Amino acid sequence: PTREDLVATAKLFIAKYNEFTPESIISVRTPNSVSHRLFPTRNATRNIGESMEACANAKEVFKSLTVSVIDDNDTIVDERTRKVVFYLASRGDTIVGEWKSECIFIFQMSEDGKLVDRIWAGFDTAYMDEFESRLDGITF
Amino acid sequence: PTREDLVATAKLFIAKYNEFTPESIISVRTPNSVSHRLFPTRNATRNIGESMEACANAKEVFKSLTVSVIDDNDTIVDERTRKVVFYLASRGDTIVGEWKSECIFIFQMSEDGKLVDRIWAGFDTAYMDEFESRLDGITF
Ligand SMILES: COC(=O)[C@@]1(C)OC(=O)[C@H]2[C@](C)(C1=O)C(C)=C[C@H]1[C@]3(C)CCC(=O)C(C)(C)[C@H]3C(=O)[C@@H](O)[C@]21C
Ligand SMILES: COC(=O)[C@@]1(C)OC(=O)[C@H]2[C@](C)(C1=O)C(C)=C[C@H]1[C@]3(C)CCC(=O)C(C)(C)[C@H]3C(=O)[C@@H](O)[C@]21C
Ligand SMILES: [Ca+2]
Ligand SMILES: [Ca+2]
Ligand SMILES: [Ca+2]
């Protein structure tokens, strides 16, 4: 799997991620793939089944989601470990207004390089708390 | 620079980092290097002078601080862009209590591979906020 192969699969994962349905967000993952969150405070680990369910729940708050690579020149590819790293802007339309943040995504690809076998996600965990405070303030 | 060369320079940066003096935290950096903090809530860019001043400021609060690569299997190396990614455990003692967190460090090396030429650091921003809250509450 070439450097170009690995980037393509990760960029496909991002595309289906932005479609943001439970089926689309697993469409580029292997059956035993797991998603990890970085950092202790929002730590979490999701298999395919758990990821689908987190998506359906997140859809009750996020009306629309776009993550995009900020700069293709900052992308990191490790051909030996089949890993790709993106630094991403995150943009959301939610029931309490605008979501705007950045995150880092690390993908390890399957041996053939066509699917995502493992994900690590580093989010701005202070911003998450701030967003949850916005959610907690919904007032009829 | 080989894969092994890039990792060695990054491990050396960590060794000197753990000495935690202004002289040591610059001793594996090119003089025009800049250190970026990731994530909007804590975004910052520091040249060498600013890094030395920040280390001296940190030493006013931190009695001790050590970082360590948790597992060499997590490490990511891009020979073409000369980049190394570490996932680290950070541990220290401070005037407002214990420090315990994890962070992701990204290094881009110089052309010869022997020095760090740019750094990106992703911290657990909610944990930093909580730590700053302890600092912002000093009262005698
Ligand atoms: C990285 O992929 C994931 O973490 C997946 C597998 O699990 C998730 O929970 C994802 C999830 C379900 C995952 O795929 C997806 C699709 C999106 C994650 C979002 C909503 C993406 C935008 C974000 O920055 C935040 C931090 C708001 C994310 C989450 O809250 C994640 O928690 C969420 C819902
Ligand atoms: C790569 O090294 C760095 O990131 C340097 C150059 O810049 C920094 O910002 C570093 C800094 C100046 C950098 O060298 C150093 C020495 C330490 C960073 C600490 C104090 C390390 C422990 C941490 O987890 C926290 C989040 C408390 C760090 C910071 O606050 C960093 O912000 C700090 C002060
Ligand atoms: Ca000071
Ligand atoms: Ca002291
Ligand atoms: Ca403050």
UniProtKB/Swiss-Prot annotation, chains A, B:
InterPro entries: Fungal_Meroterpenoid_Isomerase (IPR050977). The keyword Isomerase applies. Homodimer. Substrate binds at residues 17, 37, 46. This is Isomerase trt14. Disruption phenotype: Impairs the synthesis of terretonin but accumulates terretonin C. Belongs to the trt14 isomerase family. Residues 35-37 are annotated as: Substrate. The keyword Chaperone does not apply. Its EC number is 5.-.-.-. Changing residue 17 to A: Leads to a dramatic decrease of the catalytic activity. GO terms for biological process: terpenoid biosynthetic process. Pathway: Secondary metabolite biosynthesis; terpenoid biosynthesis. GO terms for molecular function: isomerase activity. Keywords: Isomerase. It is an enzyme of class 5 (isomerase). Isomerase; part of the gene cluster that mediates the biosynthesis of terretonin, a fungal meroterpenoid that acts as a mycotoxin. The first step of the pathway is the synthesis of 3,5-dimethylorsellinic acid (DMOA) by the polyketide synthase trt4. DMOA is then prenylated into farnesyl-DMOA by the polyprenyl transferase trt2. Methylation by the methyltransferase trt5 then leads to farnesyl-DMOA methyl ester which is further subject to epoxidation by the FAD-dependent monooxygenase trt8 to yield epoxyfarnesyl-DMOA methyl ester. It comes from Aspergillus terreus (strain NIH 2624 / FGSC A1156).
